C-alpha cells in the first residue's frame, strides 16, 4: 500500500512500496472403494449400487474438510509473513504485532475471504467398469470407484485473523470483556504500512459444536452470564461447524 | 473352501501391536469368522490384487 | 458410507463397503379377562359389559 | 465425518417436566443468570417410564 | 517424507562397471544428490512398478 500522505515543506520524497508475494503448492486427494462386479447386479433392494455414486457426496464434502483442516493447522502453519498464521509476533514494518478451544474471528464483507479455498479441478468421477482396466479380465471381477481431487487451502491474511481464545461469557468484565472484546479491539486496531488502519470489521465467528451455545450467548442475548450486560450482542454472527476439532 | 485369497501382488492392512503395517498377504473374502475384523484386515489393499483359491 | 478422502501418496488405498445388517423379530402381546354370561346379562347397573 | 445430528426432541419422565421446561422455555435457568438453551429443543413429557 | 519407491521386484538400469544391469537402488522420484549418476541409475522401470511410503 502507498505511504501516508505527508506534509509538504521544501521537496517531495519519492517513496516506494513493498510486496509480500505468497507461495503455496497444490496437493492431491483421493478415496476409492473396491467392489465385486457380480455383486452390484446380484441385488434386489437397490443397494450396493448407489455406493459407487456416493463418491460424489464424498467429493462434495471434501472441500469443507480441506479448508477446516487448514484452519486447524492455522496455528501450526505459516502465512506469507513467515510466522504462523495465528502468531503473537507478526512482523510489521516498524514493530511486531500479535494475533495469537478452536476459535477464529474473520471478516466476511472484505474483498478477500480468510482461508480461501482452491477448486482447481472439479469433482471428476473415476470409474472401473468393464474392458477398460485389467482388474476385470486378467484378475477377479473387481471394480473400483474413485473421486479425484486436486485442491488445497490457503493462508490468506494472517494480519486479520485472530485465534487462541479462552472463549468465555461471564462477569462482562473479566472473561468476555477481556477475551472476546480483546479480540475485537485487536482486530480493529490492526495497522498497515504507514500506520493507517486495515478497516477490519470482524463479522464472522467460527467455533466447533462444543462452543456453539456459549458463542450464541456472547452474541444473541442482552445479558452475558450473570445479568450484568452483553456488549457483544448482534456484533458478530456465529456459524456453527464440526470439521475442526 | 477359501473362495478367494486376494493376496497375489497386493498387500492389505494389518493392525498389530498398535502399528498397522502392510505385509504377510492375509487377504481373504468369506463369511466364515471374524467378519467384522475383515474390514480392518482388508482396509488397505494398496497394491494390485490377483485372486487365487487355496481350496481350504 | 464412502471413505474419507485421505491423500494421494501415489497409490490408492482401496476400501470396502460395510454391511450393517441388524436382525430383529416380532412378538405377541395379548391380554384379557374372564367373565360370565349370566353376570353380564343379569346385572342391573350395566357397568359389567363395557369390556 | 460428522453425523450432522439435530437434537430437537427431549423426552423425560414427569418428575423432570418442570426442570426440562426451565431448560427450554424460560430465559433464566434457576438464578436469573441466563438460559442458553431457550427455544432450542421442544420438550415433550412422558409418564410411561420410571 | 520421500515420495518415490519401487517395490514390485521391478527391473531398473543400474550400471556397475562398464555395463548396466537389472538392480533396485535409489528408486525415488525426488533428487538432491547424484542427479547426473541417478539419471543413468534411475531409468524408469522395465516391469510393473508400485510405490510405497518409506517415510525415511
Which DSSP string corresponds to A23-79? ------B--EEEEEHHHHHS-SSS-SSHHHHHHHHHHHHHHHHHHHHHHHHTTTSB-
Question: Within its chain, how far is the Cα of A94 from the centroid?
Answer: 29
Contact B49, A142 (CB under 8 A): yes
Contact A245, A72 (CB under 8 A): yes
Helix, strand, or coil here: A190?
coil
Q: Which residues of A touch D4 (CB under 8 A)?
A: 242
Taking the C-alpha atoms of residue A46 and residue C15, their distance in angstroms, rounded to an integer, is 21
Distance from CA of B33 to the nearest CA of C (A): 15
Give the helix/strand (H/E) hosting A214.
helix A212-218
Neighbours of chain A (3+ CB pairs under 8 A): B, C, D
Show the cell assigned to A206. Answer: 467460527
Half-sphere exposure of E46 (CA within 13 A, CB side): 11
First to last CA, chain C: 52
Residue position matching grid coordinates 514494518: A93
Taking the C-alpha atoms of residue E35 and residue E13, their distance in angstroms, rounded to an integer, is 15
Beta bridge partners of A122: none
Half-sphere exposure of A7 (CA within 13 A, CB side): 1
Taking the C-alpha atoms of residue A179 and residue A165, their distance in angstroms, rounded to an integer, is 7
Question: Within its chain, how far is the Cα of A169 from the centroid?
Answer: 24
Enumerate the H helices of chain B as residue ranges. 35-41
Helix, strand, or coil here: A238?
strand
B vs C, Cβ pairs < 8 A, gives 15
Taking the C-alpha atoms of residue C21 and residue A60, their distance in angstroms, rounded to an integer, is 27
Helix, strand, or coil here: A180?
helix
In this complex, does chain E touch chain A, defined as having at least 3 beta-carbon pairs under 8 Å apart?
A: no
Say if strands A32-36 and A237-240 run parallel, antiparallel, or are unpaired.
unpaired
> Per the CB < 8 Å rule, is E3 touching C11?
no
A vs D, Cβ pairs < 8 A, gives 24
Beta bridge partners of D9: D42
As to burial, measured by CB atoms within 10 angstroms (0-12 exposed, 13-18 middle, 19+ buried), residue D50 is: exposed
Taking the C-alpha atoms of residue A42 and residue A113, their distance in angstroms, rounded to an integer, is 49
Helix, strand, or coil here: E36?
helix
D6 to chain A: closest CA residue: A209
Per CB distance under 8 Å, which residues of C are interface residues toward A?
A: 1-8, 12-17
Q: In this structure, what are the phi and psi dihedrals at residue B21, rounded to the nearest 5 degrees?
A: -80, 180
Distance from CA of B49 to the nearest CA of A (A): 7
Taking the C-alpha atoms of residue A92 and residue A20, their distance in angstroms, rounded to an integer, is 12
Task: For residue A191, give Cα distances in angstroms to A13, A74, A97.
Answer: 22, 21, 9
Q: Which residues of D touch A216 (CB under 8 A)?
A: 36
Residue position matching grid coordinates 463479522: A203
Those residues whose C-beta lies under 8 Å from the C-beta of residue A230, and which sit 6 or more positions away, are A169, A172, A176, A217, A218, A221, A222, A223, A224
Task: For residue A243, give Cα distances in angstroms to A66, A70, D1, D35.
Answer: 9, 11, 8, 27
Taking the C-alpha atoms of residue A245 and residue A243, their distance in angstroms, rounded to an integer, is 7
Contact D31, D9 (CB under 8 A): no
Residue position matching grid coordinates 445479558: A223
Contact A27, A121 (CB under 8 A): no
Q: Quick check: B46 contacting C, CB < 8 Å?
A: yes
Q: Which residues of E touch C9 (CB under 8 A)?
A: 3, 53
Shortest CA distance to B3 belongs to which of A144, A38, A131, C26? A38
Helix, strand, or coil here: D22?
helix
Say if strands C14-15 and B19-21 run parallel, antiparallel, or are unpaired.
unpaired
Resolution in A: 3.0
Q: How was this structure determined?
A: cryo-EM
The torsion of the CA quartet D34, D37, A237, A84, rounded to 10 degrees, works out to: 90
Helix, strand, or coil here: B34?
coil
How many beta carbons lie within 10 A of that of residue A103, not counting itself? Answer: 21
Q: In this structure, what are the phi and psi dihedrals at residue E16, rounded to the nearest 5 degrees?
A: -95, -60
Neighbours of chain C (3+ CB pairs under 8 A): A, B, E
Contact E51, E1 (CB under 8 A): no
Taking the C-alpha atoms of residue B7 and residue A140, their distance in angstroms, rounded to an integer, is 11
Those residues whose C-beta lies under 8 Å from the C-beta of residue A116, and which sit 6 or more positions away, are A153, A154, A156
Neighbours of chain E (3+ CB pairs under 8 A): B, C
Shortest CA distance to A218 belongs to which of A185, A171, A186, A150? A171
Give the helix/strand (H/E) hosting C42.
helix C37-42
Residue position matching grid coordinates 501382488: B9
Taking the C-alpha atoms of residue B14 and residue B24, their distance in angstroms, rounded to an integer, is 9
Task: For residue C13, give Cα distances in angstroms to A46, A204, E12, E52, E55.
Answer: 26, 37, 26, 11, 17
In this complex, does chain A touch chain C, defined as having at least 3 beta-carbon pairs under 8 Å apart?
A: yes
Taking the C-alpha atoms of residue A141 and residue A40, their distance in angstroms, rounded to an integer, is 11
Shortest CA distance to C33 belongs to which of C18, C50, C19? C50
Taking the C-alpha atoms of residue E14 and residue D32, their distance in angstroms, rounded to an integer, is 81
Question: Within its chain, how far is the Cα of A173 from the centroid?
Answer: 30
Distance from CA of C14 to the nearest CA of B (A): 6
Task: For residue C1, give Cα distances in angstroms to A35, A51, A54, C17.
Answer: 14, 7, 8, 7
Beta bridge partners of A196: none
Shortest CA distance to A62 belongs to which of B41, C7, C9? C7
Task: For residue A31, give Cα distances in angstroms to A28, A67, B56, C5.
Answer: 11, 17, 33, 5
Q: Which residues of C touch E51 (CB under 8 A)?
A: 10-11
What is the DSSP-derived secondary structure letter of residue A191? B
Contact A58, C2 (CB under 8 A): yes
B vs E, Cβ pairs < 8 A, gives 9
Taking the C-alpha atoms of residue A87 and residue A77, their distance in angstroms, rounded to an integer, is 10
Shortest CA distance to A146 belongs to which of A133, A128, A119, A132? A128
Beta bridge partners of A206: A239
Taking the C-alpha atoms of residue E13 and residue E37, their distance in angstroms, rounded to an integer, is 11
Helix, strand, or coil here: E14?
strand
B48 to chain A: closest CA residue: A135
Q: Which residues of D touch A242 (CB under 8 A)?
A: 2, 4
Shortest CA distance to B22 belongs to which of B1, B5, B51, B47? B47
Taking the C-alpha atoms of residue E1 and residue E22, their distance in angstroms, rounded to an integer, is 26
Beta bridge partners of D45: D12
Closest partner residue to C18 (CB to CB) among B39, B45, B46 is: B39
Beta bridge partners of A146: A32, A126
Task: For residue A103, give Cα distances in angstroms to A61, A84, A202.
Answer: 22, 15, 13
How many beta carbons lie within 10 A of that of residue A167, not counting itself? Answer: 20
Beta bridge partners of A91: A96
Residue position matching grid coordinates 473400483: A144
A48 to chain C: closest CA residue: C17
Beta bridge partners of A29: A149
Q: What is the 3-state secondary structure (H, E, C) of B3-55?
A: CCCCCCCCCCCEEECCEEECCCCCCCCCCCCCHHHHHHHCCCCCCCCCCCCCC
Q: Which residues of A touch B50 (CB under 8 A)?
A: 139-140
Contact C8, B39 (CB under 8 A): no
How many beta carbons lie within 10 A of that of residue A242, not counting itself? Answer: 16
Contact A142, A35 (CB under 8 A): yes
Amino acid at each position: 500500500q502507498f505511504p501516508k500522505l505527508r506534509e509538504w515543506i521544501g521537496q517531495r520524497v519519492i517513496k516506494d512500496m513493498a510486496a509480500q508475494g505468497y507461495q503455496i503448492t497444490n496437493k492431491l486427494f483421493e478415496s476409492t472403494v473396491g467392489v465385486k462386479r457380480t455383486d452390484i447386479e446380484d441385488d434386489n433392494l437397490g443397494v450396493y449400487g448407489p455406493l459407487m455414486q456416493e463418491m460424489g457426496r464424498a467429493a462434495g464434502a471434501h472441500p469443507d474438510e480441506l479448508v477446516f483442516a487448514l484452519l486447524k493447522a492455522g496455528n501450526a502453519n505459516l502465512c506469507y509473513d513467515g510466522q504462523n498464521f495465528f502468531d503473537t509476533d507478526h512482523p510489521v514494518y516498524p514493530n511486531v504485532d500479535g494475533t495469537g478451544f478452536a476459535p477464529a474471528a474473520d471478516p466476511g464483507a472484505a474483498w478477500y475471504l480468510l482461508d480461501t479455498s482452491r477448486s482447481l479441478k472439479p469433482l471428476i468421477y473415476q470409474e472401473r467398469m468393464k474392458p477398460s482396466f485389467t482388474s476385470m479380465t486378467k484378475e477377479d471381477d473387481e471394480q473400483v470407484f474413485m473421486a479425484d481431487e486436486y485442491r488445497y487451502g490457503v493462508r490468506s491474511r494472517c494480519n486479520v485473523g485472530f485465534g487462541f481464545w479462552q472463549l468465555a461469557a461471564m462477569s462482562t468484565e473479566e472473561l468476555n470483556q477481556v477475551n472476546f472484546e480483546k479480540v475485537y479491539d485487536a482486530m480493529r486496531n490492526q495497522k498497515a504500512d504507514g500506520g493507517r488502519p486495515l478497516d477490519i470489521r470482524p463479522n464472522l465467528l467460527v467455533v466447533p459444536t462444543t462452543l456453539r451455545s456459549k458463542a450464541k450467548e456472547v452474541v444473541g442475548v442482552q445479558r452475558l452470564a450473570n445479568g450484568a450486560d452483553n456488549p457483544n450482542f448482534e456484533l458478530v454472527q456465529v456459524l456453527d461447524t464440526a470439521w475442526l476439532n | 473352501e477359501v473362495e478367494g485369497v486376494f493376496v497375489r501382488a497386493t498387500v492389505e492392512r494389518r493392525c498389530r501391536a498398535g502399528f498397522c503395517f502392510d505385509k504377510e498377504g492375509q487377504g481373504f473374502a468369506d463369511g466364515v469368522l471374524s467378519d467384522e475384523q475383515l474390514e480392518a484386515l482388508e482396509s488397505d489393499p494398496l497394491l494390485k490384487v490377483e485372486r487365487c483359491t487355496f481350496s481350504g
